[PDB]
Amino acid sequence: TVTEPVGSYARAERPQDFEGFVWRLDNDGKEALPRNFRTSADALRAPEKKFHLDAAYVPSREGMDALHISGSSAFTPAQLKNVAAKLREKTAGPIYDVDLRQESHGYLDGIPVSWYGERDWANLGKSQHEALADERHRLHAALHKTVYIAPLGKHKLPEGGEVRRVQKVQTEQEVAEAAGMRYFRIAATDHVWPTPENIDRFLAFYRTLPQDAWLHFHCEAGVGRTTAFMVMTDMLKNPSVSLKDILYRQHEIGGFYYGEFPIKTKDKDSWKTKYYREKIVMIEQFYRYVQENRADGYQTPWSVWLKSHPAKAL
């Protein structure tokens, strides 16, 4: 009897130790676009040094022009509009805003905020149904009430900010639709590998897409969740390209590197170590899943294949 298999490490943490306590400012709106905006039509750049990769290696670009995917971090309503217009110049198919955030978020007087708990784990352990209902209630309850909105400083605690009585409340779904994009939510936890549930939901969604759909993924700040799904899509659609090529190319357009590398962390972030290792193992397992189920149309869901082919720690 193993209590939590590789791939499900985060199930051992206690949700009650990370409840939300403040409305975090997700973007201050000074720039025209969200941070980390990147496309599969982009030129590859030099790898980041911390990953210790071969800068002379030239990754295969086979399948990229036809991939049609992009990524970024959180945005204001006007920033989303700029992303949607930019993506329209590249395609005539439907454009999707794929919201990968498990944490409750929305817009207060047009300001993008999220209910933030330590490690950004305020909805840890909740089903997607429970996570979205917490979100709808918190947002509605803010209307006509005084609130404190603030950016996180060091030690990940509030620093400065503003206080206003709220006169308008909006959902991410409402904001995407107003920008001309279709909406699809996948409640993935910040900092850890997506659950078998998050992935089964993404696979079913993928199988039903029109051949010219363009997928725009987004997380809160950084590139963690967004690169995981961008890598999975590249593999699913281009099963003939090697693991090394897929990993190098998703990193060189501006994403994270999901292959092996020398993991190092500050003392305050040592809790992240085991999660970085689990990710490396799990993306290799997914590539094994794609290669082995490619023949059919992936008749076997990921969760089922996984329970009969468990991964082992690094």
To the question of whether residue 237 is assigned a binding role by annotation, the answer is: no
**116 phi and psi angles, rounded to 5 deg:** -100, 125
- CA atoms of 238 and 178, how far apart (whole Å): 33
Residue 77: how many other CB atoms lie within 10 Å: 18
- CA atoms of 92 and 270, how far apart (whole Å): 45
CATH number of the domain within which 53 lies = 3.90.190.10
**106 phi and psi angles, rounded to 5 deg:** 180, -155
Whether 9 and 133 map to the same domain: the answer is: yes
Whether 179 and 134 map to the same domain: the answer is: no
**How are beta strands 105-108 and 169-170 bridged, if at all?**
antiparallel
Whether 16 and 81 map to the same domain: the answer is: no
**Residue numbers of the domain that contains 36:** 29-102+171-314
- CA atoms of 216 and 220, how far apart (whole Å): 14
To the question of whether residue 276 is assigned a binding role by annotation, the answer is: yes
- CA atoms of 310 and 144, how far apart (whole Å): 51
Whether 123 and 206 map to the same domain: the answer is: no
Structural domains counted in the chain: 2
Angle at 314 between CA 285 and CA 122, to 5 degrees: 75
To the question of whether residue 279 is assigned a binding role by annotation, the answer is: yes
Distance between alpha carbon 241 and the CA centroid of its chain, in Å? 23
CATH number of the domain within which 152 lies = 3.30.70.1690
To the question of whether residue 312 is assigned a binding role by annotation, the answer is: no
Angle at 75 between CA 84 and CA 186, to 5 degrees: 85
To the question of whether residue 225 is assigned a binding role by annotation, the answer is: yes
Q: Which residues contact 183 (CB under 8 A, 6 or more apart)?
A: 96, 97, 99, 172, 173, 176, 177
Of 176, 164, 161, 215, give the one whose Cα is nearest residue 79.
176
Whether 119 and 265 map to the same domain: the answer is: no
Whether 234 and 280 map to the same domain: the answer is: yes
- CA atoms of 86 and 82, how far apart (whole Å): 6
To the question of whether residue 106 is assigned a binding role by annotation, the answer is: no
Tell me the two tokens of residue 127: 């089903």
Give the chain's end-to-end CA distance (angstroms, integer): 20
Which one of 170, 192, 223 terminates a domain? 170
Alpha-helical runs (H) found in 162-265: 172-178, 196-207, 224-237, 243-252
User: What are the C-alpha distances in Å from 84 to residues 173, 229, 243?
Assistant: 14, 20, 31
With H, G, I as helix, E, B as strand and everything else as coil, classify residue 78: helix
Q: Is residue 111 within 8 Å of 149, Cβ to Cβ?
A: yes
Would you mind telling me the total number of residues written for the chain in this entry? 314
The continuous run of DSSP H or E covering 289 comes out as helix 273-293
Which one of 126, 149, 170 terminates a domain? 170
Whether 107 and 182 map to the same domain: the answer is: no
Q: Using CB atoms within 10 Å of the CB of residue 258, give its burial: 0 to 12 exposed, 13 to 18 middle, 19+ buried.
A: buried
152: which DSSP letter? B
Whether 61 and 125 map to the same domain: the answer is: no
Of 224, 243, 226, 239, give the one whose Cα is nearest residue 283.
243
Whether 33 and 12 map to the same domain: the answer is: no
To the question of whether residue 86 is assigned a binding role by annotation, the answer is: no
With H, G, I as helix, E, B as strand and everything else as coil, classify residue 137: helix
Q: What is the resolution of this structure in A?
A: 2.0
Q: Which technique was used to obtain these atomic coordinates?
A: X-ray
The continuous run of DSSP H or E covering 22 comes out as strand 22-25
Which one of 170, 196, 225 terminates a domain? 170
Whether 183 and 218 map to the same domain: the answer is: yes
- In the block, which residue shows the tokens 């699809």? 184
180: which DSSP letter? T
Tell me the two tokens of residue 235: 């593999």
Whether 224 and 79 map to the same domain: the answer is: yes
Helix-helix angle 224-237:273-293, to 10 degrees: 20
Whether 158 and 195 map to the same domain: the answer is: no
Of 46, 304, 80, 249, give the one whose Cα is nearest residue 170.
80
Q: Which residues contact 35 (CB under 8 A, 6 or more apart)?
A: 27, 72, 73, 221
